[PDB]
Design a protein around this ligand. Structure first.
Ligand SMILES: Nc1nc2sc(C(=O)NC3CCN(C[C@](O)(Cn4cncn4)c4ccc(F)cc4F)CC3)cc2n(-c2ccc3c(c2)N(c2ccccc2)CCO3)c1=O
Length: 213
């Protein structure tokens, strides 16, 4: 019932201004990066299941699901991966991301493409290419379901989730797309991006199409 507010590190805040203001074309790579993150989180629960199969029981299916919400201008990406606890969310997965954000920005100056972002472990922030506002709903076996949210601007919130559909286990990103990026709500377009950049993913990718009004 309480919204906890936190401030991003200066380096994450710097990475976020760069991405929000980048003139970079090929902005579609955000979807590869989020699918790759979903795949990695799924690999983790697969791995844990080797020694503790019961950890899978909170959500027995291993999947990635993409759900355009045209009415809300929101693209959701959901996985049944291992999830994030409150502490993980509050810390924006620090250290794994802290160091990468600074390296990624140095790599850019030395000629790297923005498409290399994921090689620095911070591909998550590529969503700012196409969205200015994002919710991260997540459920880890060892914590409750939480919602992390940011409109950028150097701050984010983390709130216990009492309103959303239960994930069981895993994470759902909700991207509030920018007005010029609404093509990523279209079934045709999403299938192209997935086929071009994520053809070899080790998990079924489900796309939800909703009968239009
Ligand atoms: N769709 C996604 N799915 C998952 S799943 C996962 C994971 O590693 N999860 C593990 C789960 C375990 N945890 C440790 C802990 O939870 C700590 N703890 C301890 N006691 C309470 N808490 C724990 C639990 C039990 C235990 F016994 C011991 C433990 F230490 C470390 C993180 C990560 C992700 N990312 C992602 C990728 C890359 C990212 C990001 C996300 N960023 C991000 C983070 C939060 C909000 C917004 C963006 C930052 C940029 O880079 C996704 O997108």
């Amino acid at each position: 019932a309480k919204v906890e507010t936190h401030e991003f590190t200066a380096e994450i805040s710097q990475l976020m201004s760069l991405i929000i203001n980048t003139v970079y074309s090929n902005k579609e790579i955000f979807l590869r990066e989020l699918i790759s993150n979903a795949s990695d989180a799924l690999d983790k629960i697969r791995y844990q299941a080797l020694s503790d199969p019961s950890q899978l029981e909170s959500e027995p299916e291993l999947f990635i699901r993409i759900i355009p919400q045209k009415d809300q201008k929101v693209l959701e990406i959901r996985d049944s991966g291992i999830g994030m606890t409150k502490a993980d969310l509050v810390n924006n997965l620090g250290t794994i991301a802290k160091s990468g954000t600074k390296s990624f920005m140095e790599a850019l100056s030395a000629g790297a493409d923005v498409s290399m972002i994921g090689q620095f472990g911070v591909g998550f922030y590529s969503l700012f290419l196409v969205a200015d506002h994002v919710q991260v709903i997540s459920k880890h076996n060892d914590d409750e379901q939480y919602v992390w949210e940011s409109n950028a601007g150097g701050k984010f919130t983390v709130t216990l989730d009492e309103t959303n559909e239960r994930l069981g286990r895993g994470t759902m990103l909700r991207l509030f797309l920018k007005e010029d990026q609404l093509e990523y709500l279209e079934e045709k377009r999403i299938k192209e991006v997935v086929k071009k950049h994520s053809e070899f993913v080790a998990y079924p990718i489900q796309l939800v199409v909703t009968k239009e009004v």
